[PDB]
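Minimal example, chain plus sodium ion.
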Amino acid sequence: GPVPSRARVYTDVNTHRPREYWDYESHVVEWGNQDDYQLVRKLGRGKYSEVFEAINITNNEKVVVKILKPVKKKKIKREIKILENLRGGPNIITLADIVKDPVSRTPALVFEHVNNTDFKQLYQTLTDYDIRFYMYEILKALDYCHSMGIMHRDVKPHNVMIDHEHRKLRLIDWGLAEFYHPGQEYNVRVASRYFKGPELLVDYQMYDYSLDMWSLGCMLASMIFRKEPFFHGHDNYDQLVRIAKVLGTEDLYDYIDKYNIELDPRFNDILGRHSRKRWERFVHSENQHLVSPEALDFLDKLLRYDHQSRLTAREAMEHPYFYTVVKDQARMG
Ligand SMILES: C=CCOc1cccc2c1-c1c(c3c(n1C(C)C)CCCC3=O)C2=O
Ligand SMILES: [Cl-]
Ligand SMILES: [Cl-]
Ligand SMILES: [Cl-]
Ligand SMILES: [Cl-]
Ligand SMILES: [Cl-]
Ligand code: NA
């Protein structure tokens, strides 16, 4: 079988916490009163939800209400426990309440902050400075949730919200998130195709927080090269083929061997041999101003086949790519 793996950071954070922290199946949800919230208008639809602006008539504050499509009870409890555990963390959506429709019993999550713009509507026209600024903010969220023992597992541009007027960023959509426990095997169907890490594509189940760092690298490459998505696979196998045509097959086969992963031999016949490409292959007159030596060094260190070799969120925060932007002077407009 495959060789085991352990996270090299935050490995035991859930172990050191009480069982109640992470045993979401045992958690009893304290539901609120749906009558406190009146929906004002529709913001959008989701893979498993409908999203509204609403008013909290008990304090006259505007809120966001996410009404969930039917899910197994275990998964709603997981999402709620994770949001409660992360509440107050940097750049993470803030769960204000949870209610059920009185008639349909459909669960709805209430979040604090309005004034949202989906990051995917903005991230292809950012300055170099703004890419670095918002990348650092996403890193703060990932370092925090990883430090709280949680993998997000669906990092992508659509799951980042921006308060543009206030330069605030929030990581949203915690419905696929899970608690990291050393030795646990995890579902390989998570994340969206273009942001799936190699571990998901080869069905290696003993992965960890570093999955999120691969997805983040895919976002970075998309922004600095203005290519959406950066790895444009047409099916799960083609996703890996597209990655291998950039990173090369040599390090992919090294990864497969290291963890004793078994690939279907006939897919391996299709993967074949591909050399690692220069990043300047993706540099064009329209994106050259976004691409620096430190950007490419940082990207190289996120987009590693071996999940154990990828930068941690804290290591990423220390990278020279962010040397100047941490000095930001908090101008709003
Ligand atoms: C104008 C956009 C505001 O949109 C917000 C605002 C706050 C919080 C959330 C969203 C949101 C969420 C989710 C989705 N949107 C959107 C894209 C419709 C799509 C499906 C998955 C999902 O969770 C929020 O949690
Ligand atoms: Cl996306
Ligand atoms: Cl397991
Ligand atoms: Cl899982
Ligand atoms: Cl591609
Ligand atoms: Cl991390
Ligand atoms: Na609010």
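DSSP finds eleven helices and ten strands in the chain. The chain has two domains: 5-22+114-329, 23-113.
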